[PDB]
Amino acid sequence: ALCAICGDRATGKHYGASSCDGCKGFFRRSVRKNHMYSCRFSRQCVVDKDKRNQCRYCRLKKCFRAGMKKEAVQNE
Amino acid sequence: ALCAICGDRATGKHYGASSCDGCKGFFRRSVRKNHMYSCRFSRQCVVDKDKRNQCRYCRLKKCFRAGMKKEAVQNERD
DNA sequence: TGAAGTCCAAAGTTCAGTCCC
DNA sequence: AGGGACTGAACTTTGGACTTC
Ligand SMILES: [Zn+2]
Ligand SMILES: [Zn+2]
Ligand SMILES: [Zn+2]
Ligand SMILES: [Zn+2]
Numbered sequence A: 001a002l003c004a005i006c007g008d009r010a011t012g013k014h015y016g017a018s019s020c021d022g023c024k025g026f027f028r029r030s031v032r033k034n035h036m037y038s039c040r041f042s043r044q045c046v047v048d049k050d051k052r053n054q055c056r057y058c059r060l061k062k063c064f065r066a067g068m069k070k071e072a073v074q075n076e
Numbered sequence B: 001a002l003c004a005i006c007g008d009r010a011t012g013k014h015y016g017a018s019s020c021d022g023c024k025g026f027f028r029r030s031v032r033k034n035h036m037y038s039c040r041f042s043r044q045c046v047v048d049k050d051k052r053n054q055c056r057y058c059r060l061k062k063c064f065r066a067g068m069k070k071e072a073v074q075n076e077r078d
Numbered sequence C: 001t002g003a004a005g006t007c008c009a010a011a012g013t014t015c016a017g018t019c020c021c
Numbered sequence D: 001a002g003g004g005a006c007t008g009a010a011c012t013t014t015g016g017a018c019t020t021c
Helices: A021-032 A056-066 B021-032 B056-066
Strands: none
Touching: A021 A056, B021 B056
8 A cells, every 4th residue: 555645655544544654744743733834836746755855835735635634633 | 972983972873874963964965965075185184073174075985984875865855 | 453642863954153256 | 245155053854663542
């Protein structure tokens, strides 16, 4: 099973979508800090294993596209 | 532990070797900008906390000899 | 046990001081 | 004078290892 966000190896369902440990942590931290970030390009950046850290905005957007929900992220 | 490159205090393992923040930073920049340093002397310069900035060629050479890996340096990001 | 959570080593970024073109 | 480059410390983000409900 591959990560629905970046294509890396998936470790199971996280926050509503199958994803790797990276996209898992990235999403949780983003939601808890209520970050939306911003893209400096056309908000259509390539989010794969190698470039996932190049644009937080696009990575986060794809997490939501993949099915992740803020609702699934807990406080603390 | 100490920096395997210059002897200064090590802040942990960096790019594969125990090193300080100075050598950590130096290696990263050297790799990302693919700088081709040269040595004015015999390429046997002593690299310590004191002289580390005297010869970039030898400090980089020491970095690789100490275990730092080019592959461990990631691409710059925002 | 599934899917939340936490921990933390090792990546990354910014920038003041300082000097060269 | 404006443009550019380097160093290393302060501080943040990443993601794999492990823990709780
Ligand atoms: Zn992923
Ligand atoms: Zn983008
Ligand atoms: Zn050092
Ligand atoms: Zn030298």
